[PDB]
Design a protein around this ligand. Structure first.
Ligand SMILES: CCn1cnc2c(Nc3cccc(Cl)c3)nc(N[C@@H]3CCCC[C@H]3N)nc21
Ligand SMILES: [Cl-]
Length: 290
């Protein structure tokens, strides 16, 4: 499929026009897999703009999947998209700005308690149960993909790797994700489904408890071989965690995806009863630390 034809299909979907009319004061706040993210001001609300080069993608079709999903799925725990545009060779998606940043910064700089860990898992499982029911697989669940509001509410972001399964095509086979968070069946190149996100969430629980995913200091291909061949990873800090948290994590990090717990199942797990309110996360954020 041609670039001119791909851009053409995307043009049918995005908002027409040049948003450099509506926006100014662009400040780069980071980089992802698919492009860069800036903050900008509307002509006075401030927004986040993700900018992706149509010609520089390993899997260009995923750009399409991204826009269509956030357009079609609004949930309290999912980052809201306001608009999307084509600007030269770039797809721009305009989204709400979340002042609390990403969970990565919390997990690498602080130790979360179980109330805080439970609140983050509850929020993510709520988003995923709704997405999974409609056949949407996120495929990049990790702390970097979890954003926080000023008052400590959790929002799933970074839908640039998502896919949708259906009755007609109920499994994917593509190798998409981030090595250390990838489910064994996905690493192995087997037909997979929504269950891959449950494993990835398990790995993000490890991040929240231990600060890092398993095998993080290994080359990514070596970590993927270990994920694929070995017993499920265990918490380095095990004696430090409750029986509720261990039993919860034991249901996520199940190698056989057919025996892995679903998002709907896990929403009924007693560990999530520990979830604290959003205000419990606030003191973990960079702006409130010293
Ligand atoms: C859904 C798009 N989006 C809205 N608001 C975002 C966001 N907020 C903040 C808030 C405070 C500091 C920073 Cl660095 C980002 N960060 C943000 N972070 C970057 C985006 C790409 C690189 C990884 C991730 N940390 N993404 C944000
Ligand atoms: Cl249990």
């Amino acid at each position: 499929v041609s670039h001119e034809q791909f851009r053409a299909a995307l043009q049918l979907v995005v908002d027409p026009g040049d948003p450099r009319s509506y926006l100014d004061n662009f400040i780069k706040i980071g980089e992802g897999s698919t492009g860069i993210v800036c903050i900008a001001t509307v002509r006075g609300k401030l927004v986040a703009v993700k900018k992706m080069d149509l010609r520089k993608q390993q899997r260009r079709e995923l750009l399409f999947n991204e826009v269509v999903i956030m357009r079609d799925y609004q949930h309290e725990n999912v980052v809201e998209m306001y608009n999307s545009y084509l600007v030269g060779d770039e797809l721009w998606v305009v989204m709400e700005f979340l002042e609390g940043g990403a969970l990565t910064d919390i997990v690498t700089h602080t130790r979360m308690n179980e109330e805080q860990i439970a609140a983050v898992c509850l929020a993510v499982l709520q988003a995923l149960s709704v997405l999974h029911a409609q056949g949407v697989i996120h495929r990049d669940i990790k702390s970097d993909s979890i954003l926080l509001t000023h008052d400590g509410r959790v929002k799933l972001s970074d839908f640039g790797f998502c896919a949708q399964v259906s009755k007609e095509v109920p499994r994917r086979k593509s190798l998409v994700g981030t090595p250390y968070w990838m489910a064994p069946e996905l690493i192995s190149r087997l037909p997979y489904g929504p269950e891959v996100d449950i494993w990835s969430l398990g790995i993000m629980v490890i991040e929240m408890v231990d600060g890092e995913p398993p095998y993080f200091n290994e080359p990514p291909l070596k970590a993927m071989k270990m994920i694929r061949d070995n017993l499920p990873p265990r918490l380095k800090n095990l004696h430090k965690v409750s029986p509720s948290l261990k039993g919860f994590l034991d249901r996520l990090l199940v190698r056989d995806p057919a025996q892995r717990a679903t998002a709907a199942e896990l929403l009924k797990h007693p560990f999530l009863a520990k979830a604290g309110p959003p205000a419990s996360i606030v003191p973990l954020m960079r702006q409130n630390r010293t």
